[PDB]
Design a protein around this ligand. Structure first.
Ligand code: 66F
Length: 379
């Protein structure tokens, strides 16, 4: 099958600011779990104990196909940790391909700041590469296992629509999910989904920064992050320009730092005072680039769970980083994104579900002439 996969359309669910999850089954007979789709990590890890925030959890004792690996894995992040016991079991995706694979599963037995109180998911599906798997690259990621064990083509694509929805098309592309053409950027290295940004424009105005800065020390595509995250020096310049572009209204310093929210009376958000953001990405051809353009609809996130206000409150979802640029849900919700593993490239097209007003629309445009794009990468 190619170009059309109706069975996989709308197979993603979520809640605002809590991410996008797919239904999966593990073990025999099959146990159903909701699993966060994460292109920014490479472990398949699931709740395996009755943590009070969990709707449900993997019960290894009930599975005839479970195999213990007799190894543990401890995984700390910046603000959260999990620890688990490694095994393999049979895994399938009910609204995905008609297959069942034997995959590595980390059965989570202790965690902190990992499961979200009030969320509807019980595990994470790391879709990135073995190089960043925990404990090490010998632990084969789920997608690698899927590709090895079946005839599913080595590609998946994501349409994230900002409760939220979307599509994860496994092993192909569904042409109804986008308009215009796909444009492809090389995956620089197979660890995270690493790409190179060669130029940044706010409202069409170049930031005029050494492009090496845009990728200090990394730029990645990550469905498991909400924000567009930028290196501080780039974030500094970006806000500076966004501040200027939006000067007809004035907002507090903390707002731009995500230390407080800003609110407006319902239906009266000044979208138009806010500038578009354009990232030019390295193209497929020497000296050729393309640009993807997002709206304030993307970087101004509605905050729903705010009991002390009755208005429309938003978070500024652009933030600074020490680990490089992260193109999170803020970017991806604008686009249909094709993770073309077989070809080591990521395609972007205008998403058929992206949220936009009648004056501006997210865009994917090319080709553009950009020299010295190699020098944009950090070593
Ligand atoms: C950035 N990170 C990432 N991509 N993957 C991890 C596994 C992760 C992701 C989430 N992601 C989310 O909860 C989330 C929330 C809203 C979104 F739009 C997208 N993702 C939660 C826990 C966790 F360990 C670790 S992380 O360092 O935090």
């Amino acid at each position: 099958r190619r170009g059309s996969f109706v069975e996989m359309v709308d197979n993603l669910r979520g809640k605002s600011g809590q991410g996008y999850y797919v239904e999966m089954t593990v073990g025999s007979p099959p146990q159903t779990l909701n699993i966060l789709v994460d292109t920014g990590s490479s472990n398949f890890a699931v709740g395996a104990a009755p943590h009070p925030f969990l709707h449900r959890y993997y019960q290894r004792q009930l599975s005839s196909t479970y195999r213990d690996l007799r190894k543990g894995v401890y995984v700390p992040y910046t603000q959260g940790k999990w620890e688990g016991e490694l095994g393999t079991d049979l895994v399938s995706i009910p609204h995905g391909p008609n297959v069942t694979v034997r995959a590595n599963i980390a059965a989570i037995t202790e965690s902190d700041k990992f499961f979200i109180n009030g969320s509807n998911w019980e595990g994470i599906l790391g879709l990135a590469y073995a190089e960043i798997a925990r404990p090490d690259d010998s632990l084969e990621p789920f997608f690698d296992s899927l590709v090895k064990q079946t005839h599913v083509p080595n590609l998946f694509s994501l349409q994230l629509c900002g409760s939220v929805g979307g599509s994860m098309i496994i092993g192909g592309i569904d042409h109804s999910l986008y308009t215009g053409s796909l444009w492809y950027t090389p995956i620089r290295r197979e660890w995270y989904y690493e790409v190179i940004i060669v130029r940044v424009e706010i409202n069409g105005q170049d930031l005029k920064m050494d492009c090496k800065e845009y990728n200090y020390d990394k730029s990645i595509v990550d469905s498991g992050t909400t924000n567009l995250r930028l290196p501080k020096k780039v974030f500094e310049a970006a806000v500076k320009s966004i501040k200027a572009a939006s000067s007809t209204e004035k907002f507090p310093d903390g707002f731009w730092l995500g230390e407080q929210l800003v609110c407006w009376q319902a239906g009266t958000t000044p979208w138009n005072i806010f500038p578009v953001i354009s990232l030019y990405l390295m193209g497929e051809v020497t000296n050729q680039s393309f640009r993807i353009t997002i709206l304030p609809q993307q970087y101004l996130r509605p905050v729903e769970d705010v009991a002390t206000s009755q208005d429309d409150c938003y978070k500024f979802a652009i933030s600074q980083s020490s680990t490089g640029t992260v193109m999170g849900a803020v970017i991806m919700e604008g686009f249909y994104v094709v993770f073309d593993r077989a070809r080591k490239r990521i395609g972007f097209a205008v998403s058929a579900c992206h949220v936009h007003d009648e004056f501006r629309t997210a865009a994917v445009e090319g080709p553009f002439v950009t020299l010295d794009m190699e020098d944009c990468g950090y070593n």
